[PDB]
Amino acid sequence: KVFGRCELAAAMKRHGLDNYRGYSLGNWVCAAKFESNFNTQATNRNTDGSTDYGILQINSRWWCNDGRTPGSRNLCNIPCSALLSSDITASVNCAKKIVSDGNGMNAWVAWRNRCKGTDVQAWIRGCRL
Question: Which helix (DSSP H) or strand (DSSP E) does residue 92 occupy?
Answer without folding.
Answer: helix 89-99
